Structure 1
Amino acid sequence: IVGGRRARPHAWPFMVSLQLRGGHFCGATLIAPNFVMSAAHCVANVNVRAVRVVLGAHNLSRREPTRQVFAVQRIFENGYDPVNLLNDIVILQLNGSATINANVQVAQLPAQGRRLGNGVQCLAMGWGLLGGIASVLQELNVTVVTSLCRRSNVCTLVRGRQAGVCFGDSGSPLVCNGLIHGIASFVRGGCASGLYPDAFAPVAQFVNWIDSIIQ
């Protein structure tokens, strides 16, 4: 996250860190005790048997007792199309069930087909590049836009300054009106261009599919 701020510890207990040999590479969202959802591009060309799923984290540079660590049991995809940058969603079924507590909670999703108007205020977040990489979870105020976007993405922009998601924020939630409306998918013009809106997978379009998998 470029131009964001540190989150209050555990303010976002659905927020997940996807890791290889101890290092963050992508975000995810806890959507049920034994399921997270991320961006399909996070896991493409990655051996998932190597991925550690980290719930309850805040400072990735610190040893944290609040954490719960899982392996990926199974993955579900929905027509990931990297050429067109479409359907950038993946569900990762965990090798066990999260212990739901103060620091580890399941996110709330919108209803199928639910659309966001131009000018809705959302929050982006993640452990990605700061402009080094983040130790503490960062958050950022962003605004939903349609100029330079498509119907098959939720796009957001910070106005009046250069701020936005960046490398390592991929897969992370976008929270709008208390609901997970986006999964961080792609940037144009590099990170925090001040010209091109950030693009997220439109979680509302995939709600029926998500529910059929989790329940």
Structure 2
Amino acid sequence: APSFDCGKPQVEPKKCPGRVVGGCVAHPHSWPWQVSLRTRFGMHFCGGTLISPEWVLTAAHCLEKSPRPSSYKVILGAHQEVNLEPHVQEIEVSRLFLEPTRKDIALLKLSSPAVITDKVIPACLPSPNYVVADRTECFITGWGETQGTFGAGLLKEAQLPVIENKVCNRYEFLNGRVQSTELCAGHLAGGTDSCQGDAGGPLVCFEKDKYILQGVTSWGLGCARPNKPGVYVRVSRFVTWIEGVMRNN
């Protein structure tokens, strides 16, 4: 039986225009790799990205809740946060892996493989050490902002242009706090606050015919605000690590 390919949504994303105040509510299931990391009891506190039927990439500090993978549950295929659609998959995490060198991202292996459908599809990973070019248009997705009457509990998205690290590190911006293993996306000398993405959530950028997971929202530093772009872990620098872990576990 054939399956669905990474990074290609079956529901065309809305693609919220840039610099839109409050961002937009996404089209249901247009971000198929969007994961909701939740406690055993069912409380959403972090986001993540399905990268393979059995693996979800999230932010390292998201694992600060508990050491036992049994305390974690993965929610897949959702749009509405509370009254989950009927097809939503809830899968308990069985193993946890922290990235050794920088310790900003973590891998979560699911107790059973997620079923890939038209609403549950992994995002594609980038070629090792790829550096996203300045100005590149990307999107961040998540349930970070509780909207008003018309978006509460709905998956939201915001388009953010990536900001070259050299520039991002300037004094008036992030002042040298940005490592090569990190990247910036945001607005300088203006813009609007984009807090939609959950810590651990995805930063995807389109490339020819698919959405590539270039970044992982960094715990606490992911909100993009004027002169203080969001900070995301640079996925391309951990691709080799990711493949090895999946290969060895």
TM-score, normalised to structure 1, is: 0.88
1:187/1:197 contact within 8 Å kept: no
1:94 matches 2:126: no
1:118 matches 2:150: no
1:135 matches 2:153: yes
Equivalent-residue separation in structure 1 for 2:62 and 2:147 (angstroms): 20
1:161 matches 2:191: yes
1:39 aligned partner, one-letter code: A
TM-score, normalised to structure 2, is: 0.76
Equivalent-residue separation in structure 2 for 1:53 and 1:187 (angstroms): 21
Q: 1:19 pairs with 21, 33, 38, which one?
A: 38
Equivalent-residue separation in structure 1 for 2:88 and 2:58 (angstroms): 19
1:39 matches 2:59: yes
Q: CA deviation at 1:134?
A: 4.8
Q: 1:194 pairs with 216, 226, 240, which one?
A: 226
SS where residue 162 of structure 2 aligns? strand
Q: CA deviation at 1:158?
A: 3.4
SS where residue 70 of structure 2 aligns? helix
Equivalent-residue separation in structure 2 for 1:191 and 1:131 (angstroms): 15
SS where residue 136 of structure 1 aligns? coil
| Number of equivalenced pairs | 207
SS where residue 26 of structure 1 aligns? strand
| Counterpart residue number, 1:61 | 82
Q: Which has the larger radius of gyration?
A: 2
Q: CA offsets, 1:106-155, max 9 Å, x none?
A: 11010000001211111111111348795111110001113234322111
Q: 1:10 pairs with 29, 40, 48, which one?
A: 29
Q: Kindly report the root-mean-square deviation, in angstroms, between the aligned alpha carbons of the 2 structures.
A: 2.2
SS where residue 25 of structure 1 aligns? strand
Equivalent-residue separation in structure 1 for 2:63 and 2:110 (angstroms): 14
| Counterpart residue number, 2:99 | 78
1:10 aligned partner, one-letter code: H
| Counterpart residue number, 1:185 | 218
2:78/2:84 contact within 8 Å kept: no
Q: CA offsets, 1:65-91, max 9 Å, x none?
A: 1211111100111127xxxxx431100
Equivalent-residue separation in structure 2 for 1:61 and 1:182 (angstroms): 26
Q: Which deviates further from its counterpart, 89-98 or 128-137? A: 128-137
SS where residue 239 of structure 2 aligns? helix
Q: Which deviates further from its counterpart, 175-184 or 39-48? A: 39-48
5+ long unaligned stretches in structure 2: 1-20, 170-177
Q: 1:187 to 1:43 in 2, by over 3 A?
A: closer
Q: Which deviates further from its counterpart, 71-80 or 129-138? A: 129-138
Equivalent-residue separation in structure 2 for 1:151 and 1:204 (angstroms): 11
2:187/2:225 contact within 8 Å kept: no
Q: CA deviation at 1:94?
A: 0.5
